[PDB]
Write a protein that binds this ligand. Structure first.
Ligand SMILES: C[S@@+](CC[C@H](N)C(=O)[O-])C[C@H]1O[C@@H](n2cnc3c(N)ncnc32)[C@H](O)[C@@H]1O
Ligand SMILES: C[S@@+](CC[C@H](N)C(=O)[O-])C[C@H]1O[C@@H](n2cnc3c(N)ncnc32)[C@H](O)[C@@H]1O
Lengths: 265, 267
């Protein structure tokens, strides 16, 4: 065979076993696929090493980036990599963002209240980043950490690109209060049409509830108003991730302005 | 509501039989209270609805079934179990006649915008788009390269929360879809980054259009590109970013909803 020397072959090299180690559960994660790896490196996550399966090209952009940052790359014979991904990285889990980080960053706050489906949560993380939100407060998500590998996968690596914070319903409302961030609650039958959302000049929190429940009462009490997305009939409802896209799309001139000024500061 | 206390009425065996052998073509199972109610409103013809002896049967459902002449029976939980084997549960469900499949013509007839998915395969995404598309007033949905054999597929049934029968949803080949749009004078636009047009201007067109969305693997395909009247981009902080496809559909349709709601309300 004279199989290329560089390819990690033994199932028990330190690195193989180190990779088993995260899998079998340091403060380090596995991050998969070319794009998520590139967003994570961009967001400043620190990597220990990037791996690809022998037999397939590593993305030139990723390689470049990996030489750009001083991130070692190596290949592992394809057979083993079936310990899962054609490309993946071991990264150090950054320290959990906190509510303060969100206020400081400027711009709209996305609050989820009892959203628990991780595919929904991940899609929302990605939308919130892309549409210029300051950050995301997760209340009642049943997540232990944002570094959960289901959420990393679902967010396509966006979970470390803006502050995403686990908080309790109480501390969340409290935080918005003493930062003077008016919140509005998304709901069917809300008084403000979502198309009027861009009119309000200052940053705001938008609160979203789960499929079933909606948002609880704590938020419904501090609210400066309710916002509705017009639908065919008043009994229908959108997926929560879809609702988030629409509301943040309406806020985008506002949030883009904030993102652009921060980029120049 | 009388009880299938146990044993096996022909009706238990028909629940069994309605899985992957010629027979499941023309009758299916629909699960859960809300999806069942959506299906009934949508005119799907039920043979019978079942509940587990155990958790109780939603009164709105009972009355709906009562208003229709749909028999409702409970099944001892011991039988409901097994039945639903290699997988999940379902404590309420119905057996139903599958509607004759919608075709493209039905979409064109209804009026209003056409949602075209090109290569979207993740059924969770398809199913969420079906709900979005109904709620926001679309005429219908053309599914191209969807990897489904039937819109009645049970995964889509669930993923759609039973909305798959509430507006015309049609499987088609790419060329067939493109040829259909062409001879019905429905201009198509492709949703993609770096387009000549902004999503916020989607509202400016008074007449209906088809909106083509690609998957995550790599946007819409050449044939759609060739027939395209333009490319519509939702602005983002940077062009390395992209949205989940179902989110994209919600934003594009929301911009078109004033236009579509008018068609839905008129005729
Ligand atoms: C009614 S639940 C069900 C959504 C869907 N079943 C899912 O998987 O998320 C949707 C949530 O998104 C928000 N939402 C849904 N439709 C909305 C609308 N038309 N206007 C404002 N908010 C809406 C609400 O906050 C609600 O808590
Ligand atoms: C990036 S791909 C798939 C994203 C995600 N992986 C998913 O779950 O679908 C998104 C598709 O939706 C439409 N789309 C997504 N983001 C868009 C944007 N920012 N502007 C215009 N269209 C967009 C395009 O058709 C594109 O091909």
């Amino acid at each position: 065979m004279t199989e290329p020397a560089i390819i990690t072959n033994a199932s028990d090299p330190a690195v193989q076993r180190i990779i088993d180690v995260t899998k079998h559960s340091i403060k380090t994660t596995l991050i998969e696929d070319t794009e998520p790896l590139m967003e994570c490196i961009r967001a400043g996550v620190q990597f220990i090493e990037v791996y690809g399966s022998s037999g397939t090209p590593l993305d030139p952009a990723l390689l470049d980036l990996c030489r750009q940052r001083e991130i070692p790359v190596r290949l592992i014979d394809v057979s083993i990599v079936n310990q899962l991904a054609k490309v993946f990285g071991i990264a150090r889990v950054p320290r959990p963002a906190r509510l303060a980080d969100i206020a400081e960053r400027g711009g709209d706050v996305v609050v989820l209240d009892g959203v628990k489906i991780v595919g929904n949560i991940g899609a929302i993380v990605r939308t919130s980043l892309a549409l210029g939100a300051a950050g995301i407060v997760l209340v009642d998500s049943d997540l232990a950490t944002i570094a959960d590998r289901r959420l990393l996968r679902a967010s396509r690596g966006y979970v470390f690109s803006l502050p995403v914070v686990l908080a309790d319903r109480e501390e969340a409302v409290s935080f918005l209060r003493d930062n003077d961030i008016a919140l509005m609650v998304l709901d069917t039958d809300g008084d403000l049409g979502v198309k009027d959302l861009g009119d309000r000049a200052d940053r705001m929190a938008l609160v979203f509830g789960s499929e079933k429940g909606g948002p609880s009462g704590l938020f419904q009490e501090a609210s400066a108003g309710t916002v509705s997305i017009p639908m065919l009939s008043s009994t229908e409802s959108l997926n929560v991730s879809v609702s988030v896209g629409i509301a943040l799309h309406e806020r985008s001139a506002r949030n883009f302005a904030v993102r652009r000024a921060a980029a120049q500061a």
